[PDB]
PDB file of C-alpha atoms in Angstrom:
ATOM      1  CA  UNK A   9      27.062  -8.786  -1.681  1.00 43.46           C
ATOM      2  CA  UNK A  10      24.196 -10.468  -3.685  1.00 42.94           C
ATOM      3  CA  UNK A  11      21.464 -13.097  -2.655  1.00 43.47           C
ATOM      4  CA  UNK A  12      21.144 -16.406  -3.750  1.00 41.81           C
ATOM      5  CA  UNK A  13      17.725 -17.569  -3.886  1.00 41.85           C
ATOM      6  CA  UNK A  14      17.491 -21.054  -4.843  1.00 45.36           C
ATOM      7  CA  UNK A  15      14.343 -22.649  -5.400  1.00 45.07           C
ATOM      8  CA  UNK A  16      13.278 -25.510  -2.646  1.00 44.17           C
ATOM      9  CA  UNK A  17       9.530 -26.320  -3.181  1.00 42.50           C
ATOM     10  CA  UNK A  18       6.706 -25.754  -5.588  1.00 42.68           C
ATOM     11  CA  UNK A  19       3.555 -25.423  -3.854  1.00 40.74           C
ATOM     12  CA  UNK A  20       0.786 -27.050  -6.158  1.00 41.04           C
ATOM     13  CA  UNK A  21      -2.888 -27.442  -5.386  1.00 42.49           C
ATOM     14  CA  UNK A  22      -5.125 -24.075  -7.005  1.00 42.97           C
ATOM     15  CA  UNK A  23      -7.453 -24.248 -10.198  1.00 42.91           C
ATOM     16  CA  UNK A  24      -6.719 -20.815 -11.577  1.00 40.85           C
ATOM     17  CA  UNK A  25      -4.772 -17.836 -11.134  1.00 38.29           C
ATOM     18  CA  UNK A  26      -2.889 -17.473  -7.533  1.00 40.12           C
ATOM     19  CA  UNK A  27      -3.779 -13.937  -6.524  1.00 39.48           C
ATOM     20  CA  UNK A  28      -1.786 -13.123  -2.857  1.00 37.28           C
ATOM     21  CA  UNK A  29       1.073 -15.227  -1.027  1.00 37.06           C
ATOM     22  CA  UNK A  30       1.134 -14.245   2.642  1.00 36.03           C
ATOM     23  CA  UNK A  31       3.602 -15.285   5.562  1.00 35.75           C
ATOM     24  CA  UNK A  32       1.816 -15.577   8.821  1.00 33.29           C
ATOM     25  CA  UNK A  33       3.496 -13.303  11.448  1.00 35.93           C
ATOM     26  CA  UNK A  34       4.916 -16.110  13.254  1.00 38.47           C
ATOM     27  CA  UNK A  35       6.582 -17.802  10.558  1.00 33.14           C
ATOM     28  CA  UNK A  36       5.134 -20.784  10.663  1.00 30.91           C
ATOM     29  CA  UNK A  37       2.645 -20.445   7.380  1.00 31.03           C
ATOM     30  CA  UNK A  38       2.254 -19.612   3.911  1.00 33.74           C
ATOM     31  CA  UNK A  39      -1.422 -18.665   3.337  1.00 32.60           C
ATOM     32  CA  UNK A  40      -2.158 -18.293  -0.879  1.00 33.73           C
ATOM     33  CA  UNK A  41      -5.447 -16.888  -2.032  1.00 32.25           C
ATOM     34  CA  UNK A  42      -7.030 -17.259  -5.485  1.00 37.45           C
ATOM     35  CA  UNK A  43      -9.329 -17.031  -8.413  1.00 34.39           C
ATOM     36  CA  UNK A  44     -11.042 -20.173  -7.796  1.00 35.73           C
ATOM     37  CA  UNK A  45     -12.425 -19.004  -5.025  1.00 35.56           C
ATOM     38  CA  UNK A  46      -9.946 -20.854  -2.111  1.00 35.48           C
ATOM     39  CA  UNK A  47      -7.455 -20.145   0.332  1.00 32.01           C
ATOM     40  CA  UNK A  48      -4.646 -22.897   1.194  1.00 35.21           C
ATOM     41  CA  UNK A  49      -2.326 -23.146   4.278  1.00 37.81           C
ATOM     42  CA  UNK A  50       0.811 -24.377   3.578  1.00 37.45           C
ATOM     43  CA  UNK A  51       3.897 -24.712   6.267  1.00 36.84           C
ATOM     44  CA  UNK A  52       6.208 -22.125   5.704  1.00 36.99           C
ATOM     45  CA  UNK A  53       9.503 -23.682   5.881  1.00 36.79           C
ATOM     46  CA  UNK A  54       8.658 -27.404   4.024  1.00 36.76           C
ATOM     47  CA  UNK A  55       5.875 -25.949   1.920  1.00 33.91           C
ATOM     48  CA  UNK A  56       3.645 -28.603   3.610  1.00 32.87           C
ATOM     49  CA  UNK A  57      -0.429 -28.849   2.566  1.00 35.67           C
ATOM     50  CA  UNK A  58      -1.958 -27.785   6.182  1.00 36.72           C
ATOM     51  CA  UNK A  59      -5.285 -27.079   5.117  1.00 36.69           C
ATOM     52  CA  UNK A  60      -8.192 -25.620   2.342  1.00 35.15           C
ATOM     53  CA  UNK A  61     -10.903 -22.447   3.696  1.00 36.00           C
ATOM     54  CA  UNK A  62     -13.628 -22.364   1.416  1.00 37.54           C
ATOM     55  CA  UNK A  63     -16.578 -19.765   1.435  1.00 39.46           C
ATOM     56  CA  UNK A  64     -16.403 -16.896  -1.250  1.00 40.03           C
ATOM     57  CA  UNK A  65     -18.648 -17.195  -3.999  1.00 38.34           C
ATOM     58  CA  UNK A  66     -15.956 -15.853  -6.341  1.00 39.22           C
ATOM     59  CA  UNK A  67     -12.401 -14.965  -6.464  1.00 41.36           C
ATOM     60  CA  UNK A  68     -10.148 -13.896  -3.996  1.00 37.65           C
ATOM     61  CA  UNK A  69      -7.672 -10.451  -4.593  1.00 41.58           C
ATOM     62  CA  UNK A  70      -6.277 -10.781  -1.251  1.00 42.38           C
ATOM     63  CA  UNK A  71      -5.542 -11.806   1.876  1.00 43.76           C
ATOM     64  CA  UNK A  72      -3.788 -10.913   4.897  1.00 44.11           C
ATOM     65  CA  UNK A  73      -3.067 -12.194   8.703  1.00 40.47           C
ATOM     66  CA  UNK A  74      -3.693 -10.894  12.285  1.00 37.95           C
ATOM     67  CA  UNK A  75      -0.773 -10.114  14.454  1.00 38.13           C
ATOM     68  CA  UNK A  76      -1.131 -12.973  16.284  1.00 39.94           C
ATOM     69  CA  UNK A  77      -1.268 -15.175  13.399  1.00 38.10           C
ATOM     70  CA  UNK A  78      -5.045 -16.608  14.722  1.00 39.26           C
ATOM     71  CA  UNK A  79      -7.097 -14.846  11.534  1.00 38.34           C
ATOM     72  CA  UNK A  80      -6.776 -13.882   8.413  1.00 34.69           C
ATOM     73  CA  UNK A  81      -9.149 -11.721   6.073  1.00 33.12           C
ATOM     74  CA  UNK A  82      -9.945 -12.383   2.607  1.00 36.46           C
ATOM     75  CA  UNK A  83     -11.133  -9.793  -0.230  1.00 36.72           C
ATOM     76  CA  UNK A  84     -13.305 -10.956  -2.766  1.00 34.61           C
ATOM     77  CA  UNK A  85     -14.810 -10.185  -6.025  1.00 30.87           C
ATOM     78  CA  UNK A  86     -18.522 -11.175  -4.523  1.00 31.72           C
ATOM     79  CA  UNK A  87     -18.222  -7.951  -2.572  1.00 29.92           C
ATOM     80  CA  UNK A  88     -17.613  -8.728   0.593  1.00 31.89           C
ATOM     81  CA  UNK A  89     -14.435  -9.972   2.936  1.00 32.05           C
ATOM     82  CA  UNK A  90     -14.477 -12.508   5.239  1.00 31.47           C
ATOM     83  CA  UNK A  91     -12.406 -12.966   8.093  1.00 31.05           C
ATOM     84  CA  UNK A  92     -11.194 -16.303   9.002  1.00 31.38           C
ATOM     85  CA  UNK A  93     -10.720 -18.599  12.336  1.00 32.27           C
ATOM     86  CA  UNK A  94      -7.267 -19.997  10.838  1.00 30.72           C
ATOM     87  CA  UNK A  95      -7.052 -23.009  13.351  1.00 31.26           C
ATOM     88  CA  UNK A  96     -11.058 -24.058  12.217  1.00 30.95           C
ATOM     89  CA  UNK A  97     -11.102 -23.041   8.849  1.00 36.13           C
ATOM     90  CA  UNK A  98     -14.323 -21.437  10.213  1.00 36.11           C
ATOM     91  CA  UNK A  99     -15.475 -18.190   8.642  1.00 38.25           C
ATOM     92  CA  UNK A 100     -16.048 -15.740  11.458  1.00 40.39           C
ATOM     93  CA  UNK A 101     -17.614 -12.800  10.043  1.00 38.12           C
ATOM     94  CA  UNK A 102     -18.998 -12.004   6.867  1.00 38.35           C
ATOM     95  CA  UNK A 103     -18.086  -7.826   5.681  1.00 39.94           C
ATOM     96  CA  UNK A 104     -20.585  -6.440   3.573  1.00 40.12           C
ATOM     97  CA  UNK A 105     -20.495  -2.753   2.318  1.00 42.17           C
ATOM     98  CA  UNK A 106     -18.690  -2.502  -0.939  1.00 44.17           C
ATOM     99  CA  UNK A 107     -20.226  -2.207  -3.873  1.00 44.36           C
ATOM    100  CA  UNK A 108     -18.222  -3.643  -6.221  1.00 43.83           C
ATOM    101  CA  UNK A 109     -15.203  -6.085  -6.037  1.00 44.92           C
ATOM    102  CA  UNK A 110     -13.277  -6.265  -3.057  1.00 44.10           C
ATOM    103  CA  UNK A 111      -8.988  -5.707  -4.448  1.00 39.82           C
ATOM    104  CA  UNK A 112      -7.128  -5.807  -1.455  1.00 40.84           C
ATOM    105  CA  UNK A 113      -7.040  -5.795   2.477  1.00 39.36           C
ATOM    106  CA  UNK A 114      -4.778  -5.548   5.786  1.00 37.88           C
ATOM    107  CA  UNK A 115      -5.478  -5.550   9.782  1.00 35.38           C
ATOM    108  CA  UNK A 116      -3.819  -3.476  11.709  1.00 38.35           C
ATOM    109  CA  UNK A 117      -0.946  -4.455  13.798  1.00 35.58           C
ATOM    110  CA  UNK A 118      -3.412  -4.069  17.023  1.00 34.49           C
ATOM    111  CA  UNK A 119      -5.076  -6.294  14.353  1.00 34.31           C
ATOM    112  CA  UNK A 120      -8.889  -4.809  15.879  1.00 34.95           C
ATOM    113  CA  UNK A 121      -9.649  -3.029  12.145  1.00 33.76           C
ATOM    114  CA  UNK A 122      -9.620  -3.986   9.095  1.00 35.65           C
ATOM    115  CA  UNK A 123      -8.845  -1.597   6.201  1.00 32.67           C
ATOM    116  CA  UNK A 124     -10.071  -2.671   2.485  1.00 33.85           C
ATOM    117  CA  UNK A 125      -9.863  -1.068  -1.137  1.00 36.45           C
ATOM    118  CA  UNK A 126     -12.297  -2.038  -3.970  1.00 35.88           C
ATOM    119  CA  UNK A 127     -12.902  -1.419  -7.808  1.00 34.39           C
ATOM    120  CA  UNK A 128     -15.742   1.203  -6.094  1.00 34.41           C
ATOM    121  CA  UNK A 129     -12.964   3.356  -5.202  1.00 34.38           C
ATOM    122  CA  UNK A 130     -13.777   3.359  -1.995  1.00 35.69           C
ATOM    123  CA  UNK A 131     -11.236   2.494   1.410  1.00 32.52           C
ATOM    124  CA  UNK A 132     -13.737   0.947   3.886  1.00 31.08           C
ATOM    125  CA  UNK A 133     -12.335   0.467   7.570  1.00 30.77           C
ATOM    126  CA  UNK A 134     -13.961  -2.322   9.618  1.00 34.69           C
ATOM    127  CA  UNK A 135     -13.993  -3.501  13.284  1.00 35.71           C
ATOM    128  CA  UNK A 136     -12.748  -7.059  13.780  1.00 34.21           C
ATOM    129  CA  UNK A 137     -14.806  -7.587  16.324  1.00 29.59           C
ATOM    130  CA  UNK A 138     -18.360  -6.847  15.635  1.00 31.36           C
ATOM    131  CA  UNK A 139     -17.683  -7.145  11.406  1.00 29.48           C
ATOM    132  CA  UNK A 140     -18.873  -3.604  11.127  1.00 29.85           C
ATOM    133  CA  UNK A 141     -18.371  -1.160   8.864  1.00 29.79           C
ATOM    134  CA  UNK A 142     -16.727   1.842  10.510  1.00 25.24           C
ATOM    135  CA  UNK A 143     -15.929   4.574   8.197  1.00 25.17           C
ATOM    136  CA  UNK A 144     -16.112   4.745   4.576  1.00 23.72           C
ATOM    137  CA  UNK A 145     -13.661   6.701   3.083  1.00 26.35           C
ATOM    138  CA  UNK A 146     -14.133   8.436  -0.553  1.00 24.80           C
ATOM    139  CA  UNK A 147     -10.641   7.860  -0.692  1.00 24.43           C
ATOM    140  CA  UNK A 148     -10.343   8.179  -4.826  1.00 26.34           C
ATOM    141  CA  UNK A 149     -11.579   8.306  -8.489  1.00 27.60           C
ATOM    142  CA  UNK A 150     -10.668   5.187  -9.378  1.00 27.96           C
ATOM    143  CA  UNK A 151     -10.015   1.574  -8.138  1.00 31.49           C
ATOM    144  CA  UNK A 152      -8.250   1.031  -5.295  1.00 32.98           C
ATOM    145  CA  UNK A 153      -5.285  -1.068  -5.385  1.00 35.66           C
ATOM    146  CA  UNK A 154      -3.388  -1.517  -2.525  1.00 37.63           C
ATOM    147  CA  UNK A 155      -4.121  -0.319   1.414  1.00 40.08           C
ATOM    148  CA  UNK A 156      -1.838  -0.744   4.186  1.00 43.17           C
ATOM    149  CA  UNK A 157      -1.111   0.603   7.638  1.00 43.08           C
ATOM    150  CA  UNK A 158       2.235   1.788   9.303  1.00 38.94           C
ATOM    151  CA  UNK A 159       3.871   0.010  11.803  1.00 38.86           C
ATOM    152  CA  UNK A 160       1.667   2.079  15.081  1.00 39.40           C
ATOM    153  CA  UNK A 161      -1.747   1.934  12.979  1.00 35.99           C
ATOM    154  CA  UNK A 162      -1.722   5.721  13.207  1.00 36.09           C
ATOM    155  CA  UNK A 163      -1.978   6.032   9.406  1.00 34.72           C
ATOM    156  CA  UNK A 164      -3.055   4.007   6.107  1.00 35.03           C
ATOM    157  CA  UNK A 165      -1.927   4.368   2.865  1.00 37.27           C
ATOM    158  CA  UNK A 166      -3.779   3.665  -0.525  1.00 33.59           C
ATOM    159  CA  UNK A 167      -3.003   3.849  -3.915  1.00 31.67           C
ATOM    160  CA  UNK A 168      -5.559   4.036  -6.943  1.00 30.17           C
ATOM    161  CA  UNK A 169      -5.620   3.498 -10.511  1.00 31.94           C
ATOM    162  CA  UNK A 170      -6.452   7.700 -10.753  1.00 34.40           C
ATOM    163  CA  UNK A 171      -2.462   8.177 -10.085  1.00 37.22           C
ATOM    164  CA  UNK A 172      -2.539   8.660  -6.647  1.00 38.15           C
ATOM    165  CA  UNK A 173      -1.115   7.806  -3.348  1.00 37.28           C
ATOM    166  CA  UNK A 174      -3.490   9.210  -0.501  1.00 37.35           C
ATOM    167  CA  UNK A 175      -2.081   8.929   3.205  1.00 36.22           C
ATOM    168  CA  UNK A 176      -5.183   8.778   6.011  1.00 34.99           C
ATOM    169  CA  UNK A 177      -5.501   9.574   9.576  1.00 33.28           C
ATOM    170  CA  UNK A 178      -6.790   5.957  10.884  1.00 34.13           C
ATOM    171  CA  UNK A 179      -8.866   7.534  13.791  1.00 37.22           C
ATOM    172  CA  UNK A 180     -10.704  10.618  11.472  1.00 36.83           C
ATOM    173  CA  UNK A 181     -10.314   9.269   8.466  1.00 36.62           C
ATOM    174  CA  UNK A 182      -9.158  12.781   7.225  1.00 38.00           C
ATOM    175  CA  UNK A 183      -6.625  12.832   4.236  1.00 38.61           C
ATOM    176  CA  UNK A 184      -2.936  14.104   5.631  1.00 34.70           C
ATOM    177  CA  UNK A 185      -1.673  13.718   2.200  1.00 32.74           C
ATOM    178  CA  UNK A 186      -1.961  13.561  -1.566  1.00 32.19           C
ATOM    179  CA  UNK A 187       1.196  12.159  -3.495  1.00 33.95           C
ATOM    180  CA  UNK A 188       0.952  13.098  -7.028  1.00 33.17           C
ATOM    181  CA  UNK A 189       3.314  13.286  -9.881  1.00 33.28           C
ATOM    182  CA  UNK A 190       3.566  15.319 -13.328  1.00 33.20           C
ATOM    183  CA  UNK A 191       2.083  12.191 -14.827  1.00 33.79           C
ATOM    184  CA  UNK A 192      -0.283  10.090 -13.289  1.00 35.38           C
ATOM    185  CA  UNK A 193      -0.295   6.298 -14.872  1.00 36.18           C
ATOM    186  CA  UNK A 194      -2.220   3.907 -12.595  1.00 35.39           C
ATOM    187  CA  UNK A 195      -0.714   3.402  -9.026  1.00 35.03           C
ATOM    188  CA  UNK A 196      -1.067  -0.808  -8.845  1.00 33.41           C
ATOM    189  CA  UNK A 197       0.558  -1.410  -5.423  1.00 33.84           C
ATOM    190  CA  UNK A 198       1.589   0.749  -2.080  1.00 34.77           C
ATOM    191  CA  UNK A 199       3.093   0.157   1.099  1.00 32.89           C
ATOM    192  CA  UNK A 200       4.782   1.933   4.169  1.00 31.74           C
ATOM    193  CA  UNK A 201       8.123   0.780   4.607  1.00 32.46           C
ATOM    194  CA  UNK A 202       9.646  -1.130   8.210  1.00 31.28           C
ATOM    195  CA  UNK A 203      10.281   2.470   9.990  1.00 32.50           C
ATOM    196  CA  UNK A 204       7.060   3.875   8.421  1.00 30.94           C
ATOM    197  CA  UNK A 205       8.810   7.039   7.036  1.00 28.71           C
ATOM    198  CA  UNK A 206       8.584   5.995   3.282  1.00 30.18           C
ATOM    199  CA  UNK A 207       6.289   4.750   0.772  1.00 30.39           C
ATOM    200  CA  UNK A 208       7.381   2.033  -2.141  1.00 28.12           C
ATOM    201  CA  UNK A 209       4.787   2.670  -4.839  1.00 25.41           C
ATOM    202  CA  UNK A 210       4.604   0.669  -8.555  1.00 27.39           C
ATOM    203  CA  UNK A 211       3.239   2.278 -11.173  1.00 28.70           C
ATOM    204  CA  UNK A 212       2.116   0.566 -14.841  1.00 26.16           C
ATOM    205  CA  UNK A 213       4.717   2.441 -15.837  1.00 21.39           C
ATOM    206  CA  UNK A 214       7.183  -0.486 -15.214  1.00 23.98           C
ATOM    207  CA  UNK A 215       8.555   1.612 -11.904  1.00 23.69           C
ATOM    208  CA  UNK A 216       8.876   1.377  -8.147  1.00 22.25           C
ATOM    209  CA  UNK A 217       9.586   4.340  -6.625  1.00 23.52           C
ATOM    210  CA  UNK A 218      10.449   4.853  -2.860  1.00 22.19           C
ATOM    211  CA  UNK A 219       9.468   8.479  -1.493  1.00 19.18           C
ATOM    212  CA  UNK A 220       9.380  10.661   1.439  1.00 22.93           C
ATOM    213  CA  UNK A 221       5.914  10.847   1.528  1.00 19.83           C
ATOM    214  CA  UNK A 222       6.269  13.931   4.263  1.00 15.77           C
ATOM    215  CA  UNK A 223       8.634  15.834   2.262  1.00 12.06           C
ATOM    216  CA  UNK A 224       6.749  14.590  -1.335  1.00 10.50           C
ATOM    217  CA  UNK A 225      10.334  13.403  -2.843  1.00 10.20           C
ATOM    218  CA  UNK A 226      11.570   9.987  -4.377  1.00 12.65           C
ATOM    219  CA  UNK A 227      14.699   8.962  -3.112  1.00 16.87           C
ATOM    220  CA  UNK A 228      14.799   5.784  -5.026  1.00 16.14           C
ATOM    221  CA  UNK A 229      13.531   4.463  -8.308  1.00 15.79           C
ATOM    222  CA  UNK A 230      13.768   0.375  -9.323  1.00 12.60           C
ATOM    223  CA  UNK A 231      13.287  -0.430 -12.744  1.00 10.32           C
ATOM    224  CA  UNK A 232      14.005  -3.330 -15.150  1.00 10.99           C
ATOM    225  CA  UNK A 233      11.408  -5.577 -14.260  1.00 11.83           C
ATOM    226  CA  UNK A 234       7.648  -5.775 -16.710  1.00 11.14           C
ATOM    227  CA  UNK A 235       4.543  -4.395 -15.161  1.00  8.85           C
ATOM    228  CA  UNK A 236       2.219  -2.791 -17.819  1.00  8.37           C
ATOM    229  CA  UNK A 237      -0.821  -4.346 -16.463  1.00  7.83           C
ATOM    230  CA  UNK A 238      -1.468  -6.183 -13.144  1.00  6.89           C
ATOM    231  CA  UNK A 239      -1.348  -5.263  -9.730  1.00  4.51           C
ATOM    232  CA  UNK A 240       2.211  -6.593  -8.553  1.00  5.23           C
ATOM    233  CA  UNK A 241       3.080  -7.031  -4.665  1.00  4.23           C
ATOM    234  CA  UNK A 242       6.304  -5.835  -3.734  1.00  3.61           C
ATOM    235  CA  UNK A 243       8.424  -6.102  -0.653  1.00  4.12           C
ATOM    236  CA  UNK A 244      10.870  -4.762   1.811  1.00  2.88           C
ATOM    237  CA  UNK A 245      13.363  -7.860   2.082  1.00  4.39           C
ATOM    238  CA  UNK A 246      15.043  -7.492   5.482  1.00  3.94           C
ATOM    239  CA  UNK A 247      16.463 -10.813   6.953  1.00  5.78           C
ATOM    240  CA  UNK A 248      19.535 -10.378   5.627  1.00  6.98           C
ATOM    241  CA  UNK A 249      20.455  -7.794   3.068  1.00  6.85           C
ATOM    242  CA  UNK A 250      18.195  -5.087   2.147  1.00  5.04           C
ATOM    243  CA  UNK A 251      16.599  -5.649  -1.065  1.00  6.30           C
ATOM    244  CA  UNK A 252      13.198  -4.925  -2.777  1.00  3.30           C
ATOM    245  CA  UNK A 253      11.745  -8.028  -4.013  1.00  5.08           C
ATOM    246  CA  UNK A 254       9.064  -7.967  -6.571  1.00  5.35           C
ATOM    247  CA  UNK A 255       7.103  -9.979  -9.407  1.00  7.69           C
ATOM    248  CA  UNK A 256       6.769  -9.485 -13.273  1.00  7.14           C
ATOM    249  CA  UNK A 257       5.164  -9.971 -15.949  1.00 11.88           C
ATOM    250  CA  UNK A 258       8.052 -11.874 -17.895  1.00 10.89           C
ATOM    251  CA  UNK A 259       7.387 -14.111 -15.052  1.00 10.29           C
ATOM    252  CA  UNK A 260      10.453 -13.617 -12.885  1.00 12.60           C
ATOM    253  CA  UNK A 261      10.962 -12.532  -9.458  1.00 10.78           C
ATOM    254  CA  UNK A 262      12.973  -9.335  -9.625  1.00 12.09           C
ATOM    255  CA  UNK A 263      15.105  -8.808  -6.476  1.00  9.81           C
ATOM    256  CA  UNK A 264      17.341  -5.167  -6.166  1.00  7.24           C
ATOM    257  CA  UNK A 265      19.598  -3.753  -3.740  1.00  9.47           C
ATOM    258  CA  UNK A 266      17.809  -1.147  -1.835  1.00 10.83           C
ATOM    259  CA  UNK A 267      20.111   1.684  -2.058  1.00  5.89           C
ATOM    260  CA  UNK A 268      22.316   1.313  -5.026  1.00  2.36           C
ATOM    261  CA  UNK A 269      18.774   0.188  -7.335  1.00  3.35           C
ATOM    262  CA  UNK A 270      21.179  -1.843  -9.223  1.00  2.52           C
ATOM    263  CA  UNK A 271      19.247  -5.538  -9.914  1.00  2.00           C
ATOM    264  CA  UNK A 272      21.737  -8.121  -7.835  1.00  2.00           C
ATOM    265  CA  UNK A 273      19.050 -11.729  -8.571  1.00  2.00           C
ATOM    266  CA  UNK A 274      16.357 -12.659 -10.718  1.00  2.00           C
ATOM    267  CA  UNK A 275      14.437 -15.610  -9.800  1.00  2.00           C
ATOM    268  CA  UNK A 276      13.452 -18.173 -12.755  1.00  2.00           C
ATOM    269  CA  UNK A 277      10.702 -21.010 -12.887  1.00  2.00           C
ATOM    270  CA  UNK A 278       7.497 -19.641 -13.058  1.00  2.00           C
ATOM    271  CA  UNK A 279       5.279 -20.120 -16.324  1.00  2.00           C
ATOM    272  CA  UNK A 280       3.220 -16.447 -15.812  1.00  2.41           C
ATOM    273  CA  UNK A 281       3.047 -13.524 -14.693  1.00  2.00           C
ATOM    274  CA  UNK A 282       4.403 -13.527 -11.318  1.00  2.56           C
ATOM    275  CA  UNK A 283       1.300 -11.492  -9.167  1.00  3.35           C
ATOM    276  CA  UNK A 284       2.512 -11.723  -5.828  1.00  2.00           C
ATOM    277  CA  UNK A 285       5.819 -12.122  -3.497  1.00  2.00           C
ATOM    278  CA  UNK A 286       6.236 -12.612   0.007  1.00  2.00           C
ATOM    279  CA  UNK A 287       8.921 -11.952   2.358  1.00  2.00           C
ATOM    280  CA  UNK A 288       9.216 -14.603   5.454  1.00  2.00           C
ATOM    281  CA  UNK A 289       9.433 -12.655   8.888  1.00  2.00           C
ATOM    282  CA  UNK A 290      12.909 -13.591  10.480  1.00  3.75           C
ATOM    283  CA  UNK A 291      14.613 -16.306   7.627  1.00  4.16           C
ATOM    284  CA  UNK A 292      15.678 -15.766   3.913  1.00  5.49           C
ATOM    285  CA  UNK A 293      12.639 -16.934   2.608  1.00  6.85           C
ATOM    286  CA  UNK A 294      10.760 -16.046  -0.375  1.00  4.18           C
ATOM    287  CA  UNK A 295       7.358 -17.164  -1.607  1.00  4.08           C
ATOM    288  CA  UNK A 296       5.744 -16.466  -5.012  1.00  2.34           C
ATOM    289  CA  UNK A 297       2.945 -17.190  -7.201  1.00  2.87           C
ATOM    290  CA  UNK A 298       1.974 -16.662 -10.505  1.00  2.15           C
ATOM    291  CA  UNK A 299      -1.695 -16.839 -12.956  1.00  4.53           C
ATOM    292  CA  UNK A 300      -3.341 -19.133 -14.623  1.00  9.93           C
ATOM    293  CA  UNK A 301      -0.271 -20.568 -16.818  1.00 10.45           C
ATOM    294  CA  UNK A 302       1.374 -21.467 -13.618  1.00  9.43           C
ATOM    295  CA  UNK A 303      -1.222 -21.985 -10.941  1.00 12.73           C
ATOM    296  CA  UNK A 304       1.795 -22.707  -8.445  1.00 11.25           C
ATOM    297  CA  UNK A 305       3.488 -20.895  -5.260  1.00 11.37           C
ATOM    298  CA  UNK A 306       7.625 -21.331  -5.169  1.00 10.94           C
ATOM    299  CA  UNK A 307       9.498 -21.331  -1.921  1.00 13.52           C
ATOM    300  CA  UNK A 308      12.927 -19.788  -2.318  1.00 10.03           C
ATOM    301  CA  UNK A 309      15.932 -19.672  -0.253  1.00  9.25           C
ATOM    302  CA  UNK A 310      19.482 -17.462   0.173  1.00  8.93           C
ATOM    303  CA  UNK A 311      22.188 -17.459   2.178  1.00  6.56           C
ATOM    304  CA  UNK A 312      21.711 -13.713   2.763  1.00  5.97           C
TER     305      UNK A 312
END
């Protein structure tokens, strides 16, 4: 059994690079970030223009949505994040504390924290409420690249260009543990997997790797695609068959069986680099977007 993604909309509208494609948790939106300094809200399923948020001063790395699909939160290279009344377009706090740009961010699913990474190497955790900074973690010697929390909150992961993935206590902020390999190229992208025992990790080594992160052993390794040099979102595709689904820098969408590793699609259209996929929640959806070639999101869909 193999997808078959199909392309059904190209989502046009950004000046420069597309830097994050997001489904809301509901389904019912596409949120992009970018370079020129905008996010757009598109309908999920149509790829209908909903609406432009405008605030940063410069670029956005990231962004990411609220369990209840009401906010979102934006990383930026002017330092801060913002988070983001989605129904206004109304920016509702301002977070200030890094010092130096702002790569990536998530809530938690109880969606009251915020947990960011930034070029200052640092993993700041913020309450939603108050904007607050509430821990700063020295969480590694090198930029940060990707931070994420399991599926109770209990614990974040982040992954750094100084080869490692660290795995954090959310409440003390104390390091549980310290993946690291023989070799130690830069770790561009990290995230706990649906059940939250795993990690999928890419490296700038051209690798994904899927580990145990308790018992510090990769169980699967998915290869074939190009990434040498930008921070590449991947995902756990699980609407229909499992697959990891992830961009490239020969501007494809690489898609793989989960368990054999064996490529089963790869998605063509794009004009660069493809930075960022998406996953939709409960349908065979995929969104991605690519740099400044491109400047455009695709909507794809499979019969499985």
């Amino acid at each position: 059994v193999k997808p078959n993604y199909a392309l059904k909309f190209t989502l046009a509208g950004h000046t420069k690079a597309v830097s994050s494609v997001k489904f809301s948790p509901n389904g019912e939106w596409l949120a992009s970030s970018s370079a020129d300094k905008l996010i757009k809200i598109w309908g999920a399923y149509d790829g209908k223009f909903e609406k432009t948020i405008s605030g940063h001063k410069l670029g956005i790395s990231d962004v990411a949505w609220s369990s209840d699909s009401n906010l979102l939160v934006s990383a930026s290279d002017d330092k801060t994040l913002k988070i983001w009344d989605v129904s206004s377009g109304k920016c509702l706090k301002t977070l200030k504390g890094h010092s130096n740009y702002v790569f990536c961010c998530n809530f938690n699913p109880q969606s009251n924290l915020i947990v960011s990474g930034s070029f200052d190497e640092s993993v700041r955790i913020w309450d939603v409420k108050t904007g607050k900074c509430l821990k700063t973690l020295p969480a590694h010697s090198d930029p940060v690249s990707a931070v994420h929390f399991n599926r109770d909150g209990s614990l974040i992961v982040s992954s750094s260009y100084d080869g490692l993935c660290r795995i954090w206590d959310t409440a003390s902020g104390q390091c549980l543990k310290t993946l690291i390999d023989d070799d130690n190229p830069p770790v561009s992208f990290v995230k706990f997997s649906p059940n939250g025992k795993y990690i999928l990790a890419a490296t700038l080594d051209n690798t994904l790797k899927l580990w145990d992160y308790s018992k510090g052993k990769c169980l699967k390794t998915y290869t074939g695609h190009k990434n040498e040099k930008y921070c590449i979102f991947a995902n756990f595709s699980v609407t229909g068959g499992k697959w990891i689904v992830s961009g490239s820098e020969d501007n494809l969408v690489y898609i793989w069986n989960l368990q054999t590793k064996e490529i089963v699609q790869k998605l063509q259209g794009h004009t660069d680099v493809v930075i960022s996929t998406a996953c939709h929640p409960t349908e065979n959806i995929i969104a991605s977007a690519a740099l400044e070639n491109d400047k455009t999101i695709k909507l794809w869909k499979s019969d499985c």
